[PDB]
Design a protein around this ligand. Structure first.
Ligand SMILES: C[S@@+](CC[C@H](N)C(=O)[O-])C[C@H]1O[C@@H](n2cnc3c(N)ncnc32)[C@H](O)[C@@H]1O
Length: 240
C-alpha cells in the first residue's frame, strides 16, 4: 500500500535530517531517570519505529524488547541499533494482540513519540491498552506520550519547530475526530499525516478504565520555540 510507503518515506526523511545525538540532547534523561528510580530492568518498546527510544534504553543498560507492527520499521531499527553498536531484539506485533508473539512480562512499557494517537477507533484503543496492561508485571509501569491536542482544539494555529528549524509541524485541520499535520523539513520536503487528537483527560480516562491504578501526566516542552502550553504530555501509568 501507498500509505505504508508514504510513512516509510517520512521516517527516512526524519532520520536523514535529524541526528539522534541532537535528539537525545533535547529529550531529557527524564524517562531514563523515571525507569531507573523504579528499579526497572526489562523494558518493552511497543512503538519502536526506527529505534531511537529502544537504542536510548539499550545504551542506558536496560534489557529491551523492540516491537512494532511494521516489519519494515523493525529492519530500519535493527540496522540503526547495529550502527550504534547494539544488538536489537525485534518482534513484529500488533498492539491489539501483543501477547500473540510476546511471551514474557515486563517492568515497563514505552509507547513514545506520539504513537498511540494513530488509532482512530475507541475499541482498538481499549484493546491496545488492555494488551499493554497484561504485559506488565504486577508492579509494572506504562509510559505513553501524545501531543497536546487540547491546546489546538480550544484555540494555536501556527507551526511548531523541532531540532532547531530542521522540521516544522503545522496543524492543517483539527476537529475532535481528526488532526492532520503538515510536516515540512529544512530541505523542502513536505509530508502530511493523519492522527487522532487525544484529549489529555480522555487518555487518562482510558488508562483508568482498562485497570491502571495511578496515573501521573507530565507536561513536556519539546518544541524549539516554547509557548505557555507544553506541546506534549507524558502519561506515567502505574499498574499499581
Ligand atoms: C510515530 S512512530 C514512533 C517511533 C519511535 N517511538 C520514536 O519516537 O522515534 C509509531 C510506530 O508505531 C507503529 N504502530 C502504529 N500502530 C500500531 C499498531 N496498531 N500495532 C503495532 N504498532 C503500531 C508504527 O509502525 C510506527 O513505527
Amino acid at each position: 500500500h501507498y500509505e505504508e510507503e508514504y510513512v516509510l518515506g517520512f521516517v527516512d526523511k526524519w532520520d536523514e535530517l535529524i541526528d539522534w545525538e541532537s535528539r537525545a540532547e533535547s529529550e531529557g534523561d527524564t524517562i531514563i531517570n523515571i525507569l531507573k528510580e523504579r528499579g526497572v530492568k526489562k523494558v518493552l518498546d511497543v512503538a519502536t519505529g526506527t529505534g531511537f527510544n529502544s537504542v536510548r534504553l539499550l545504551q542506558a543498560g536496560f534489557d529491551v524488547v523492540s516491537a512494532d507492527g511494521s516489519a519494515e520499521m523493525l529492519v530500519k531499527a535493527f540496522d540503526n541499533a547495529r550502527d550504534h553498536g547494539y544488538l536489537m531484539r525485534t518482534v513484529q506485533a500488533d498492539w491489539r494482540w501483543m501477547n500473540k508473539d510476546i511471551h514474557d512480562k515486563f517492568d515497563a512499557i514505552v509507547c513514545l513519540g506520539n504513537s498511540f494517537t494513530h488509532l482512530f477507533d475507541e475499541g482498538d484503543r481499549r484493546k491496545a491498552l488492555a494488551e499493554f496492561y497484561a504485559l506488565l508485571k504486577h508492579d509494572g509501569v506504562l509510559l505513553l506520550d501524545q501531543r497536546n491536542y487540547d491546546a489546538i482544539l480550544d484555540d494555536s494555529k501556527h507551526a511548531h519547530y523541532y531540532c532547531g528549524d530542521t522540521v516544522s509541524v503545522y496543524p492543517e485541520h483539527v476537529d475532535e475526530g481528526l488532526a492532520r499535520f503538515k510536516y515540512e523539513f529544512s530541505d523542502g520536503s513536505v509530508y502530511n499525516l493523519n492522527m487522532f487528537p487525544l484529549r489529555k483527560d480522555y487518555t487518562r480516562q482510558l488508562l483508568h478504565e482498562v485497570g491502571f491504578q495511578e496515573i501521573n501526566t507530565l507536561g513536556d516542552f519539546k518544541e524549539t520555540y516554547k509557548e505557555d502550553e507544553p506541546d506534549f504530555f507524558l502519561h506515567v501509568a502505574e499498574k499499581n
